[PDB]
Coordinates of C-alpha atoms and ligand atoms in Angstrom, one line a residue:
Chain Q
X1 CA -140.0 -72.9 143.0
X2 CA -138.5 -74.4 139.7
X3 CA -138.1 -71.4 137.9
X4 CA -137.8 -67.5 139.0
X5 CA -137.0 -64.4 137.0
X6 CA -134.9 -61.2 138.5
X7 CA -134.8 -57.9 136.2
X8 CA -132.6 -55.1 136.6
X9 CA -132.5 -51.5 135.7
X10 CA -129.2 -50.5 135.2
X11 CA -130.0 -47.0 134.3
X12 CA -131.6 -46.6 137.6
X13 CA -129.5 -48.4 139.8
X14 CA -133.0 -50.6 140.8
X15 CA -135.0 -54.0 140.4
X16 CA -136.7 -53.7 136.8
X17 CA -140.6 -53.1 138.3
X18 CA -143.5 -54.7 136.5
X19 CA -141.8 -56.5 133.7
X20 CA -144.3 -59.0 131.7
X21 CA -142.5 -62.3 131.3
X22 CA -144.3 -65.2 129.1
X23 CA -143.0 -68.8 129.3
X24 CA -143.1 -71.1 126.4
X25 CA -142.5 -74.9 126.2
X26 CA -140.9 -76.9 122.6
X27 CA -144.2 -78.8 121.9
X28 CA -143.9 -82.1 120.0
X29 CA -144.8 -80.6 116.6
X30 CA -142.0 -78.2 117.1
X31 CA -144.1 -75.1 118.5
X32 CA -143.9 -72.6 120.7
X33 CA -146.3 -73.3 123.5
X34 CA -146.9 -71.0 126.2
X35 CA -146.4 -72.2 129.1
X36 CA -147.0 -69.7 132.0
X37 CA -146.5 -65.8 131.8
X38 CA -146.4 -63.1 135.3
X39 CA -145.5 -59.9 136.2
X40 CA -142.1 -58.9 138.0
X41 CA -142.3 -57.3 141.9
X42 CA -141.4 -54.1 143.2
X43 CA -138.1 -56.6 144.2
X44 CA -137.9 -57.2 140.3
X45 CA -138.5 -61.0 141.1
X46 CA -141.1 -63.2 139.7
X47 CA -142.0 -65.9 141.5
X48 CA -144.6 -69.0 141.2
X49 CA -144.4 -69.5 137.4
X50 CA -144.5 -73.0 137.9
X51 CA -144.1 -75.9 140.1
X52 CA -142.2 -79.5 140.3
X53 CA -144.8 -81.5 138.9
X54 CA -145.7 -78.9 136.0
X55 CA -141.9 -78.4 134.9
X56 CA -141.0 -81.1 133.3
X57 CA -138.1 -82.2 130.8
X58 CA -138.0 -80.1 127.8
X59 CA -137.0 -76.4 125.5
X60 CA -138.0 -73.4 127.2
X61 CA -137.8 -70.3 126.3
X62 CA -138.1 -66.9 128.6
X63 CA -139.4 -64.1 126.8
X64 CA -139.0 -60.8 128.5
X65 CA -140.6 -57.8 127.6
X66 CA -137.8 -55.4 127.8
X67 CA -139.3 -52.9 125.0
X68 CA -143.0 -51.9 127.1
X69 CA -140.8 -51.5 130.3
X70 CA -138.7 -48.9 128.6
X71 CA -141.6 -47.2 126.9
X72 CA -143.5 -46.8 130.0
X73 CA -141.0 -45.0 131.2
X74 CA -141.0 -42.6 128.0
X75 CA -138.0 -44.5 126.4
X76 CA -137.5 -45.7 123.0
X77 CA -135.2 -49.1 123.4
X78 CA -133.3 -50.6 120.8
X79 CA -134.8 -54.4 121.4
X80 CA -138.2 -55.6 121.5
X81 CA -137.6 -58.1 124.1
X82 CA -135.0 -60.6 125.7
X83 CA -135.6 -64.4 125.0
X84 CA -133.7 -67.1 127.1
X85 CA -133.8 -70.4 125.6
X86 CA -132.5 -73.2 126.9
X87 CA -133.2 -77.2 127.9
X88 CA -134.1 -77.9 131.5
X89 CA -134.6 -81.2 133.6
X90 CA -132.2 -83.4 131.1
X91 CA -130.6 -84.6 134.5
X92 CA -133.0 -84.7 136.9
X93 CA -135.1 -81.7 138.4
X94 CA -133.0 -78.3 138.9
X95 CA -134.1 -74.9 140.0
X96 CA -133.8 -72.4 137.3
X97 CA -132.7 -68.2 137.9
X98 CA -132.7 -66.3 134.7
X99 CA -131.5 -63.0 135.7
X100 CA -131.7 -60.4 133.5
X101 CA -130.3 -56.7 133.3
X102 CA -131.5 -54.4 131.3
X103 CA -130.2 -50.9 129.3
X104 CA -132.5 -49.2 126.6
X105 CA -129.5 -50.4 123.6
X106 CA -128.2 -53.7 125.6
X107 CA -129.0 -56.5 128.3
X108 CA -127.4 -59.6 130.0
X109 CA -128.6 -62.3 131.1
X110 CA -127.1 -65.6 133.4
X111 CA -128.8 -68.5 134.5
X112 CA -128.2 -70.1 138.0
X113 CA -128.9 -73.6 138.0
X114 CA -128.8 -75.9 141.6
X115 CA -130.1 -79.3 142.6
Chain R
X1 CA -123.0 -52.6 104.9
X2 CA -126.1 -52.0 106.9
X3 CA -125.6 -54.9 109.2
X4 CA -122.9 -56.5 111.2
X5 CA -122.4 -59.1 114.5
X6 CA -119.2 -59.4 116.6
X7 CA -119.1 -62.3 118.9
X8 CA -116.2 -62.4 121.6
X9 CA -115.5 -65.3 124.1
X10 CA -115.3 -64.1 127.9
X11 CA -113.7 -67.6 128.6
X12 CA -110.9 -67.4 126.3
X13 CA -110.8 -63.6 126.1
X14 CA -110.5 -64.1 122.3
X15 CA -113.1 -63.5 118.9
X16 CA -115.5 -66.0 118.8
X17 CA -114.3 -67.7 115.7
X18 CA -116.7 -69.8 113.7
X19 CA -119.6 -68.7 114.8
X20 CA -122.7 -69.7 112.9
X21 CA -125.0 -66.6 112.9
X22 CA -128.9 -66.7 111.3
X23 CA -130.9 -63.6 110.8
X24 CA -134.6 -63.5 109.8
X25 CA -137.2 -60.7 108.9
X26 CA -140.7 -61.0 110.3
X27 CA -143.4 -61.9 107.7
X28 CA -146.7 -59.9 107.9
X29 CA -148.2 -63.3 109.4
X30 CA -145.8 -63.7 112.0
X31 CA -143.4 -66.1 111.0
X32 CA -139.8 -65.1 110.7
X33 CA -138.4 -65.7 107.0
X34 CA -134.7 -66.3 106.6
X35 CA -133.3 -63.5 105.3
X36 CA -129.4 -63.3 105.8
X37 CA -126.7 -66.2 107.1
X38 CA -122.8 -66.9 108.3
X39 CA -120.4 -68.0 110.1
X40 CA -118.1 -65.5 111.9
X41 CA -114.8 -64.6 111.1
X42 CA -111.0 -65.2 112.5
X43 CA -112.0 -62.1 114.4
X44 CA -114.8 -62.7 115.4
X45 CA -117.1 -60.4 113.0
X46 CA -119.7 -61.4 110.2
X47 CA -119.9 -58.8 107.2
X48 CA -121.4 -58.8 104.4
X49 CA -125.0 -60.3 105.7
X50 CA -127.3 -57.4 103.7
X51 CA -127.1 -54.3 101.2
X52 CA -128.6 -51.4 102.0
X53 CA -131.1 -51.8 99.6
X54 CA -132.2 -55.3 100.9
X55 CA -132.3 -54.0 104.3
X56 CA -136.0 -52.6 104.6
X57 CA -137.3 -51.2 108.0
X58 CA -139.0 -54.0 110.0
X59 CA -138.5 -56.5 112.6
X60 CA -135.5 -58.7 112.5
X61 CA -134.1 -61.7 114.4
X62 CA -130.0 -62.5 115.2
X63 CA -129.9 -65.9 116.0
X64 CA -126.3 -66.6 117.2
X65 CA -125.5 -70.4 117.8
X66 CA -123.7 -70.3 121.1
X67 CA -124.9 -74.1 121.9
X68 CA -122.6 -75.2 119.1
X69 CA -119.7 -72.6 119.7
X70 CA -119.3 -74.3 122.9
X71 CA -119.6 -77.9 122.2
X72 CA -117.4 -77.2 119.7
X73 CA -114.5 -76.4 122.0
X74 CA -115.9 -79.4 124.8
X75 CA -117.2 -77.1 127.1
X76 CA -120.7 -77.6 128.7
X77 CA -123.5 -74.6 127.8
X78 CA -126.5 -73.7 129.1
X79 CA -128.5 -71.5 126.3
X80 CA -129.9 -73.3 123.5
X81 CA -128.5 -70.2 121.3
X82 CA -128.8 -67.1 121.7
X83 CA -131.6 -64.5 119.6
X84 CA -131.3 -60.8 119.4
X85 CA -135.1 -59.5 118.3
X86 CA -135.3 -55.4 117.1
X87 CA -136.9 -52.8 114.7
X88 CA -134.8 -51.2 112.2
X89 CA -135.7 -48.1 111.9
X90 CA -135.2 -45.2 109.0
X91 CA -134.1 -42.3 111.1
X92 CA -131.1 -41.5 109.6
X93 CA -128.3 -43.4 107.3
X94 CA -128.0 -46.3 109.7
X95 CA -125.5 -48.8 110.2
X96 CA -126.2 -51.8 112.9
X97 CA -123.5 -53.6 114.6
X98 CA -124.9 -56.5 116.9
X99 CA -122.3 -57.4 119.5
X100 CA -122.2 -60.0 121.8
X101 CA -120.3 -61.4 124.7
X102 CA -120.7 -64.9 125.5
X103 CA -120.3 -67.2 128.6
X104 CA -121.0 -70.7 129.0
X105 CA -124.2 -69.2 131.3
X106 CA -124.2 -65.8 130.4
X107 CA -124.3 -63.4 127.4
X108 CA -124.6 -59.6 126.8
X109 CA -125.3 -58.2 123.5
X110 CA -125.5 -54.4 122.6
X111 CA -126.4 -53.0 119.5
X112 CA -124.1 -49.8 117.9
X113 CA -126.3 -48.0 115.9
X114 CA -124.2 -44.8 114.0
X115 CA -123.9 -42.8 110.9
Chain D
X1 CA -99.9 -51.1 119.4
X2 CA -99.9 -53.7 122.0
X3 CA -102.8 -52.4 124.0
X4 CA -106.2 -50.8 122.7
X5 CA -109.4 -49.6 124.9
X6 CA -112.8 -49.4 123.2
X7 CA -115.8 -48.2 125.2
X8 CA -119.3 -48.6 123.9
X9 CA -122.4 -46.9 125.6
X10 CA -125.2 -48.9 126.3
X11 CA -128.1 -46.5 127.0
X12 CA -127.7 -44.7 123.3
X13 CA -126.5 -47.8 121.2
X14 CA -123.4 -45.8 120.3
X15 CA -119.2 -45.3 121.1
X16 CA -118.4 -43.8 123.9
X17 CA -117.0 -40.7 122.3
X18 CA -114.2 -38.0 124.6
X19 CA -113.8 -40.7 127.3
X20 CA -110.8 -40.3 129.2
X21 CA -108.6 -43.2 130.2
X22 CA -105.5 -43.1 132.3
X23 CA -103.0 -46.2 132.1
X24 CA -100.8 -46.7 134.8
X25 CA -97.7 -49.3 136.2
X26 CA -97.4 -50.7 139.5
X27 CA -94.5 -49.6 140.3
X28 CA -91.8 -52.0 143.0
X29 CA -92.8 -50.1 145.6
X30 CA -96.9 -50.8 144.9
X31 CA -97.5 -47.8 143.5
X32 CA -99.2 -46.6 140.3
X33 CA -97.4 -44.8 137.9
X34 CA -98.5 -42.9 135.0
X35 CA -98.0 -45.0 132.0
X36 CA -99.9 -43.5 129.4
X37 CA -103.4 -41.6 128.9
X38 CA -105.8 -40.7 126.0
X39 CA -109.6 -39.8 125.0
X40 CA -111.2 -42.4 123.1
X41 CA -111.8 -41.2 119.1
X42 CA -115.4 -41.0 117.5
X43 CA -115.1 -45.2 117.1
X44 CA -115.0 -45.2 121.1
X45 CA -111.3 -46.7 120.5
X46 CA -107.9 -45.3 122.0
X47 CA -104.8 -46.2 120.1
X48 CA -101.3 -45.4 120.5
X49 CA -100.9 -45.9 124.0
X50 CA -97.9 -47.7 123.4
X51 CA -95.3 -49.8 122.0
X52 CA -94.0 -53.2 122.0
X53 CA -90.4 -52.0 123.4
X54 CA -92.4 -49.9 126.3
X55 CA -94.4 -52.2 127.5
X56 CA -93.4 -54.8 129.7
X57 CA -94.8 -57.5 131.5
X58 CA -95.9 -55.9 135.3
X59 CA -99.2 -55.1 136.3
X60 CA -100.7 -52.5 134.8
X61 CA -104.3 -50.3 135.6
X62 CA -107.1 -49.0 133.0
X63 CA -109.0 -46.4 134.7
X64 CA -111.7 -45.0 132.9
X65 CA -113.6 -42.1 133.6
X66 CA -117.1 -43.2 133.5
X67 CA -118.1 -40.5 136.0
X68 CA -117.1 -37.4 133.5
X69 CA -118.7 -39.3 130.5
X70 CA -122.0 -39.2 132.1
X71 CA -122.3 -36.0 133.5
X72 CA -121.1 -34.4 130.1
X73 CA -124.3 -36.0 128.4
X74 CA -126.5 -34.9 131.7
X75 CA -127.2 -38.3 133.1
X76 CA -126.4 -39.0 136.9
X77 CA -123.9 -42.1 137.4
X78 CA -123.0 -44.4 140.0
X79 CA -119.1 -45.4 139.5
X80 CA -116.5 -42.9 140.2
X81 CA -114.8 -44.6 137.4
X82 CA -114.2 -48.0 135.8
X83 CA -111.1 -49.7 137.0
X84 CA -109.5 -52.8 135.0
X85 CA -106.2 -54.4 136.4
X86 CA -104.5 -57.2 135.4
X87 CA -101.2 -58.7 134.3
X88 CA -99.2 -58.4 131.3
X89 CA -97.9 -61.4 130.7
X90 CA -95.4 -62.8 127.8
X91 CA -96.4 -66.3 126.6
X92 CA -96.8 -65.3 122.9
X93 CA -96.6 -62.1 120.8
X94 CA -99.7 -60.5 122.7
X95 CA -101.9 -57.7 121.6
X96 CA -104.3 -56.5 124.7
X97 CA -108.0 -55.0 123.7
X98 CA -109.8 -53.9 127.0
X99 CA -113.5 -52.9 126.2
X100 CA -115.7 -51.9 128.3
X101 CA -119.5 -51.4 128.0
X102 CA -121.0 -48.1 130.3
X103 CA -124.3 -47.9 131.7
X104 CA -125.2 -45.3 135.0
X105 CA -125.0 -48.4 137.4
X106 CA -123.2 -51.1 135.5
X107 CA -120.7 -51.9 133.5
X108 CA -118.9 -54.7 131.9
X109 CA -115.3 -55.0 130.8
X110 CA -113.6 -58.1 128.8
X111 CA -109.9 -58.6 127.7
X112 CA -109.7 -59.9 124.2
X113 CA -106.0 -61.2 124.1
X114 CA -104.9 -61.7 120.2
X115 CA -101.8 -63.0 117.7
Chain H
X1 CA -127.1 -54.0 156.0
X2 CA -126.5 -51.1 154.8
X3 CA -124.1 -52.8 152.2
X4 CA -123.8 -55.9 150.6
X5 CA -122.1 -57.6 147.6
X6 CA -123.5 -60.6 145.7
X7 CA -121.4 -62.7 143.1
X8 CA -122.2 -65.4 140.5
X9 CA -120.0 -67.4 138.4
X10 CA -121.0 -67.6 134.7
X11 CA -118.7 -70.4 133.6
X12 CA -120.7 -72.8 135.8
X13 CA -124.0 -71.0 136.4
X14 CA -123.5 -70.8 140.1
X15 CA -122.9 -68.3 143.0
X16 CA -119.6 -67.2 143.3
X17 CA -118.4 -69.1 146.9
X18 CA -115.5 -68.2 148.9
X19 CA -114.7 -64.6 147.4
X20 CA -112.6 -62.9 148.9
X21 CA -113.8 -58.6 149.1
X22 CA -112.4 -55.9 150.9
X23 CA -113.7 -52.7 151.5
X24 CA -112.1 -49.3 152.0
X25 CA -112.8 -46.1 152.6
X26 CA -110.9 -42.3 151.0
X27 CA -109.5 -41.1 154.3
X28 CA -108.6 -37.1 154.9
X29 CA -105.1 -37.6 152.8
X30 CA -106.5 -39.0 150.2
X31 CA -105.4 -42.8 150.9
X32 CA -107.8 -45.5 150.8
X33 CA -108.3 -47.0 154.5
X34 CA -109.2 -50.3 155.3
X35 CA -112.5 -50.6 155.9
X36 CA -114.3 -54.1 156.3
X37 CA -113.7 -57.1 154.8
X38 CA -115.6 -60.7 154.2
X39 CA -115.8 -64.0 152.1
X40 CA -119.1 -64.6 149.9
X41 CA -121.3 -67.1 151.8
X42 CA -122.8 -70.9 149.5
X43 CA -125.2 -68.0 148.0
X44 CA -121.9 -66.1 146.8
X45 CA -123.8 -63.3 148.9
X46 CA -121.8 -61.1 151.4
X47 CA -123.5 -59.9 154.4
X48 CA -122.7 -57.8 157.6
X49 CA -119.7 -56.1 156.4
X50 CA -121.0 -52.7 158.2
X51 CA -123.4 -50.9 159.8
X52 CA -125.9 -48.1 159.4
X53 CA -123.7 -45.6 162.2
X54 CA -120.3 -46.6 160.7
X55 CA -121.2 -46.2 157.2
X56 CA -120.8 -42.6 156.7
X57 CA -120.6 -40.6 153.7
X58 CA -117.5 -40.9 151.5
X59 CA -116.0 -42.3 148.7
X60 CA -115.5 -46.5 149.2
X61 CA -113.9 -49.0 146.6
X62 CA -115.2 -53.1 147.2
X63 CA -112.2 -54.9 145.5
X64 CA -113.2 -58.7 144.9
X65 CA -110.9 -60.9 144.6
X66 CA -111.6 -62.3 141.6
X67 CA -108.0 -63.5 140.7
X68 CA -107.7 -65.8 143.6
X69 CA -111.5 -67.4 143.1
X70 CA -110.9 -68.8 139.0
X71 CA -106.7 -70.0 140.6
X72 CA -108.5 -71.8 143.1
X73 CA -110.6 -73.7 140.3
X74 CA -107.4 -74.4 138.8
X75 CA -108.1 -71.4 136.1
X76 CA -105.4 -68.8 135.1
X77 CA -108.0 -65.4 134.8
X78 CA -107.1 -62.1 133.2
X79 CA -107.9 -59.6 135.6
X80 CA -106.4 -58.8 139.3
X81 CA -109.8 -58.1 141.0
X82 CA -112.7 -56.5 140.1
X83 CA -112.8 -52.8 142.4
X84 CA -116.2 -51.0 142.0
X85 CA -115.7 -47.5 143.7
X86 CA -118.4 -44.6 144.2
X87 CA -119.5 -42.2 146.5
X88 CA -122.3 -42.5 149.2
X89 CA -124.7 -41.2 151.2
X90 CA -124.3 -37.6 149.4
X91 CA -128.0 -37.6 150.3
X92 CA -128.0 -39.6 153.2
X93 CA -128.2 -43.2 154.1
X94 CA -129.1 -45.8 151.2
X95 CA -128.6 -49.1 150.9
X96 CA -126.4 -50.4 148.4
X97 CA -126.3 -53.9 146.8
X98 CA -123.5 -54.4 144.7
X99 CA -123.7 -57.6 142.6
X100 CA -120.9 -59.1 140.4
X101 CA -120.9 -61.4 137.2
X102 CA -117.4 -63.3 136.9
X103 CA -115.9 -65.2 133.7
X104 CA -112.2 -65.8 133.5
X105 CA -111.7 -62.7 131.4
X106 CA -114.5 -60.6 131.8
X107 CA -116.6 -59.6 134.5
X108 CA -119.6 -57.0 134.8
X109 CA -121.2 -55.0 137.8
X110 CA -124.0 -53.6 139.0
X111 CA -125.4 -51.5 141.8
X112 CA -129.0 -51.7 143.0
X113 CA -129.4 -48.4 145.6
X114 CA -132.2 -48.2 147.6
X115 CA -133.7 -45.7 150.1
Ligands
LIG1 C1 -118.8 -58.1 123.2 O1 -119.7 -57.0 123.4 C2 -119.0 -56.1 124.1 C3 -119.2 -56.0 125.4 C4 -118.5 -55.0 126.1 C5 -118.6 -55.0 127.6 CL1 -117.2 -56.0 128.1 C6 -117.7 -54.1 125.5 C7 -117.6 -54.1 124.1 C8 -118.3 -55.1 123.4 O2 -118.1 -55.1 122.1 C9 -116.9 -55.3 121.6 C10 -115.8 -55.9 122.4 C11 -114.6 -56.1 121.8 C12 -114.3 -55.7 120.5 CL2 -112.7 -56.0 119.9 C13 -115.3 -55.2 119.7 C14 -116.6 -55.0 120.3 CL3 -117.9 -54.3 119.3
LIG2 C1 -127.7 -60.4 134.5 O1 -128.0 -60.5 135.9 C2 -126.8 -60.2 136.6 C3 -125.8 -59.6 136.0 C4 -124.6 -59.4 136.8 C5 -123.4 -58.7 136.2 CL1 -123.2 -57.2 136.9 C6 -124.6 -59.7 138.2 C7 -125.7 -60.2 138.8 C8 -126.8 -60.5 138.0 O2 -127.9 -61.1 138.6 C9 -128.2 -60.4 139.7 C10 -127.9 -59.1 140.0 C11 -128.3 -58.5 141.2 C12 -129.0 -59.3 142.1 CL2 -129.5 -58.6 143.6 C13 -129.3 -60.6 141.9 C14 -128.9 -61.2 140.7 CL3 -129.3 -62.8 140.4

C-alpha cells in the first residue's frame, strides 16, 4: 500500500468514521484529475487507494471531506474540506500516511513518508 | 478588516515572515477567481487583504506558500503549499483570522471567527 | 512583558475566554513554585505576568486549565490540564509567547520566541 | 494494552524512534508515583507499558521526553517534555492511545479512548 489516510476526531477522542476522501493527480494540461476516492473505517484508516504500479511520479492532492463528517453528526464546521498537496515518487517509490485530525473550526495534518 | 492570516514557524518558534499568501473566491462555474494577495509581515500576519464591502458571503480559498517559505530558509518540505477552503457566512459582524502553524511535514490552521 | 499566553478554541473558532493559567519556577530543590497566574482576557491573551527584572533564566511551567474551560461551556474533556515546560534561556533580549490551541482530546502548544 | 503512546516527528515526516516516556500515577498524598516506563519502537509506537489488572483508576501523567529526542539529532528544542495527564477508568476499563506530534518548538496531542 502506497498511500493510506488516518482521520481523527478530536472532539470525541476517536478514529474519524466514514470520512469520504477523493484523490486527484496534476494531469499534463495542468488539471485536476481524480485519481481514486474511498471511505474511512471504523479504525478511521483508509486503505487500498492505490497500488505500486498505479502511483506513479507526479502532484497529488488529498481532499478530505471534513465538512459532511461534521454535519452528519449535526455540526456546522468552519471548513469545507482538508486538501493535502504534495509531489510523490521524485526519488524513487515511497509509502505515503496523510494523517489528519479534525475539530469543527481547525485540523492538522502530517505526512509520513518511508522507503 | 474582514480578513486576516497569521503564519508561525514551529521550527524556529518565530512569525513566519515573508510569507506569500493567495486567496480566491469561487466563481458560479467552479473555478476560483483571484480575489485578494500578500506576503506576510515581520510578524508574521497579512492585513489589509479585503474591505468589508468587497467581502461578500461565498466560498473562499487561502492558499499559503509553505513550499517556498521553506526552500527559502534551505530546509526540505513536503506540502506543495498549503490551501484553507470555507464559506463566509453573514451571521453576525464577522471578522476572520486564518491562522496557521507550519512544519516541514505538518501544519494546523484554525480559523477565529469574532465580533 | 517578557512572557504572554494566548489560547484559541478550536471547536467554536473563537479565544479561549476566562482560562486560567498558573506559572510556576522550579525551584533548587525540584520543586514548583508559584510564579505568577492570570485568566486569559476576551482576546484569549494573558499579559502582565511579568517583568524583565523578575524573570530569570530557570525552568519555568505553563499550566493551563483546560479541564475547567470545558466543563464551564458543558462539553466533557480529556486533559486534566495543559502543561508547557521549558527553559528560559538568555541569548538575546527574548520575549516568550506560549499559545496553545484546545480541543476535548487534543491540543497543541508552540513557543514563538521574538526581538 | 490497555495503554499505549505513538509519536511522529514532523521535521522529517517520520515516527518518532527512541523516545524516551514515563508514566506515573497520583498516589494517596498527592505525589505522582512512578509508574511504567518505555522507549518508542522503529514505528515511534510504545507498547506493553501495563496491563488490564494493574491499570486501575486514577489520575496518570505520560511525560515524553521530547527534549532529549531533537538534542540527540543535534537540535536545541524549546520545550522540557511533553506530559499529557488525565484521569481513567472513571467508568471502567478503556483503552487509551495517546499519540504525539513533535517539532522543535511545538508539539500537539491527542487521545483516541476506546471501550
Ligand atoms: C499558529 O496557529 C496557532 C496554533 C496554536 C496551537 Cl500551538 C495556537 C495558536 C495559534 O495561533 C496563534 C499562535 C501564536 C500567535 Cl502570536 C498568534 C496566533 Cl493567532
Ligand atoms: C494529524 O495527525 C496526527 C497528529 C498528531 C498530533 Cl497530536 C499526532 C499523531 C497524528 O497522527 C496520528 C494520530 C493517532 C494515531 Cl493512532 C495515528 C496517527 Cl498517524
Amino acid at each position: 500500500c502506497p498511500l493510506m489516510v488516518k482521520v481523527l476526531d478530536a472532539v470525541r477522542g476517536s478514529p474519524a468514521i466514514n470520512v469520504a476522501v477523493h484523490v486527484f493527480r496534476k494531469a499534463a494540461d495542468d488539471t485536476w484529475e481524480p485519481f481514486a476516492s474511498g471511505k474511512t473505517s471504523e479504525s478511521g484508516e483508509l486503505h487500498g487507494l492505490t497500488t505500486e504500479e498505479e502511483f506513479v511520479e507526479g502532484i497529488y492532492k488529498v481532499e478530505i471531506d471534513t465538512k459532511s463528517y461534521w454535519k452528519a453528526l449535526g455540526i456546522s464546521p468552519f471548513h469545507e474540506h482538508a486538501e493535502v498537496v504534495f509531489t510523490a515518487n521524485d526519488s524513487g517509490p515511497r509509502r505515503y500516511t496523510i494523517a489528519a485530525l479534525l475539530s469543527p473550526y481547525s485540523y492538522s495534518t502530517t505526512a509520513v513518508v518511508t522507503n
